[PDB]
Amino acid sequence: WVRYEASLRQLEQRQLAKSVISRVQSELGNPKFQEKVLQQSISEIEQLLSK
Amino acid sequence: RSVLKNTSVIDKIESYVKQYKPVKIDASKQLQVIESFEKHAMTNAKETESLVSKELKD
Amino acid sequence: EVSSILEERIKGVSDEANLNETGRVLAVGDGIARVFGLNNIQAEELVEFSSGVKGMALNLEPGQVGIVLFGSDRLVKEGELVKRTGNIVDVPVGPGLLGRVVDALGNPIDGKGPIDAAGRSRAQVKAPGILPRRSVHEPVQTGLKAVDALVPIGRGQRELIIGDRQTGKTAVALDTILNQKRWNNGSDESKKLYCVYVAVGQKRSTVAQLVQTLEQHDAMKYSIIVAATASEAAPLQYLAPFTAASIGEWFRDNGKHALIVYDDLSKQAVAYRQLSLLLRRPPGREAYPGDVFYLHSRLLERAAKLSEKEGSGSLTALPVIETQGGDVSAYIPTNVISITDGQIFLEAELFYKGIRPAINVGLSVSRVGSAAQVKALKQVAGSLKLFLAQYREVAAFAQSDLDASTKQTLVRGERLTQLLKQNQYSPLATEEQVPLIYAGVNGHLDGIELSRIGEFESSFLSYLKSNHNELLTEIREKGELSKELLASLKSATESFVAT
Numbered sequence A: 001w002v003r004y005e006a007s008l009r010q011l012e013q014r015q016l017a018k019s020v021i022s023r024v025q026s027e028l029g030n031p032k033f034q035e036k037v038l039q040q041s042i043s044e045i046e047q048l049l050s051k
Numbered sequence B: 001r002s003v004l005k006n007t008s009v010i011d012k013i014e015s016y017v018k019q020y021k022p023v024k025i026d027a028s029k030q031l032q033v034i035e036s037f038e039k040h041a042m043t044n045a046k047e048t049e050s051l052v053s054k055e056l057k058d
Numbered sequence C: 001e002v003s004s005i006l007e008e009r010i011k012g013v014s015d016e017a018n019l020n021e022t023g024r025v026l027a028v029g030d031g032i033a034r035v036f037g038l039n040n041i042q043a044e045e046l047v048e049f050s051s052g053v054k055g056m057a058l059n060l061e062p063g064q065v066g067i068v069l070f071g072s073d074r075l076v077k078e079g080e081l082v083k084r085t086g087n088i089v090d091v092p093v094g095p096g097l098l099g100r101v102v103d104a105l106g107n108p109i110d111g112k113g114p115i116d117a118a119g120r121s122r123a124q125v126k127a128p129g130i131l132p133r134r135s136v137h138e139p140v141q142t143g144l145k146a147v148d149a150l151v152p153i154g155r156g157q158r159e160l161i162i163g164d165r166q167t168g169k170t171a172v173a174l175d176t177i178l179n180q181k182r183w184n185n186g187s188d189e190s191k192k193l194y195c196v197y198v199a200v201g202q203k204r205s206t207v208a209q210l211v212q213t214l215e216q217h218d219a220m221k222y223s224i225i226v227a228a229t230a231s232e233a234a235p236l237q238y239l240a241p242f243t244a245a246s247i248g249e250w251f252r253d254n255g256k257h258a259l260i261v262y263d264d265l266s267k268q269a270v271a272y273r274q275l276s277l278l279l280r281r282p283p284g285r286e287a288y289p290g291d292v293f294y295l296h297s298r299l300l301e302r303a304a305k306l307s308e309k310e311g312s313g314s315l316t317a318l319p320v321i322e323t324q325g326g327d328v329s330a331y332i333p334t335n336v337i338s339i340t341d342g343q344i345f346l347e348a349e350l351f352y353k354g355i356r357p358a359i360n361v362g363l364s365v366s367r368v369g370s371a372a373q374v375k376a377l378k379q380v381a382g383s384l385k386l387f388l389a390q391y392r393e394v395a396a397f398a399q400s401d402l403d404a405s406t407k408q409t410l411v412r413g414e415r416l417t418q419l420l421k422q423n424q425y426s427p428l429a430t431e432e433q434v435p436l437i438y439a440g441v442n443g444h445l446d447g448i449e450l451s452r453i454g455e456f457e458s459s460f461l462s463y464l465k466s467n468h469n470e471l472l473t474e475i476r477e478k479g480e481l482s483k484e485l486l487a488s489l490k491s492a493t494e495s496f497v498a499t
Helices: A002-027 A032-049 B010-019 B033-057 C002-011 C169-179 C204-216 C234-252 C265-278 C292-300 C331-339 C348-352 C384-398 C404-420 C430-441 C450-468 C470-478 C483-498
Strands: C023-028 C032-037 C045-049 C053-061 C064-070 C081-088 C090-093 C101-103 C119-122 C161-164 C195-200 C223-228 C259-263 C316-323
Touching: A002 C002, C045 C064, C053 C234, C064 C234, C090 C234, C119 C234, C161 C169, C161 C331, C169 C195, C169 C204, C169 C259, C169 C316, C195 C204, C195 C234, C195 C265, C204 C223, C223 C234, C234 C259, C234 C265, C234 C292, C265 C292, C265 C316, C265 C331, C292 C331, C316 C331, C384 C404, C384 C430, C404 C430, C404 C450, C430 C450, C430 C470, C430 C483, C450 C470, C450 C483, C470 C483
Parallel strands: C101 C223, C161 C316, C195 C223, C195 C259, C259 C316
Antiparallel strands: C023 C032, C023 C081, C032 C064, C045 C053, C045 C081, C053 C064, C090 C119
């Protein structure tokens, strides 16, 4: 019973793994792909000034 | 039952073990029939003993 | 649950820092890459490529650094950015590696998630000096007669196990781990070996059978398995024994007794050969590079019985050498033999010819093994090696007529050899080995007809326990056979002989 319980958790995790891939393909579609480059830009501005 | 999530079987076998915790009765009960074999044996024992004691001195 | 653990992990991604990173890959393939930049780099660093794979910098050259890819070349490619880990190759070491299969990157291939590890420690670490080194005193008991008697094995020692491939090669070692289940599941930590099984170059399937056997004997909890299978990359295989020994050293440097079995160092040689050739460094004898001696010797001498200062830690090495045809003059075997204390050459011919386990008594030696033996196993086993090297002589010249003196030796000898044999994957207790050796030595098994020897063993042991397990308890604690015990045992054994 414990063994299959662990197996179900692993199965859930790989199911949620392919859902992560699906979410990644969605993210890279959005012009959040464009807009977040601005976020990275300002973050790097803050970061590198903190260097 | 602090790692199983597919529960409701730990209480089942807990109860099955603690239920049949009284296991079937002791098998001390041959001591009348076992005693009888000893009686037969004793008859033979005494026969041998008395005979050979007599014969030795003879 | 699974959501919470994943969420915790996602939260644990948080920002990248600036620092000296970035080399750019140029000439790559042949499992080495030539990177441009990496101007200040510690020697033998771990670098992680942005190909998501790591390599160990080997050649620091004017204007270029030549990484060696510790991992697949498939994902590495030209003009990739190589980022400095900034740290020399270290591997997590600690207490929580116990009962966890891990691969060579320390990734849990038992898949029981992140390993609990106290520290990380550099892959190469020099062996302790003369001053930290105390001569062996505690034995290692394998539970197999003759493998404790004729071959006396003691803690710290680099005690070679040499023999031919797949003669159930693994089994000799497995039995050792199993016998020491008794002591290791003990409460005395002086009687706790923490045993590491290094599986190099073995099929992942085979390792899975081994893992399953170990978990069947519930032996996983006192042992670690490190795995670098045959499929797994040769540079990883090269670093595989070294990493395992670092883990072993953490136990040793807790002053706690430990043991490490390196299966099979011969396959490390082939790996180092491959690596060397791909670094196009000139090949040595049998095409094995000239630094092959250095490779094995640096590895082997890290296994030791340290002194009281170091807390008297042990790290008993059992390195498993796979001889090509029983080529006992072959370069790799001879090089190993010279480093190692003793040999445990296993007689293949006899193995095939129904002696399991088969130990070539002549080609088994143990340099300092015999002072590890406990007095019971010195007294009872006194001169049995000589006797069976009189059996060795006797059967040498047996091949016409036999004088009664010779015949007596032959009758004992043949029967004694039968006694040595054990059932593969089922070792006997240490306590039990003492009477069995007593019987034959004290000539009780002289008369016993050859056919009933197997019966004699089981029945004798059952007899001893039933008649008086008190004797065995005494010999268990005393560990020395007193004159009274010796006489009592002579009497008791004679009693068993009668039945």
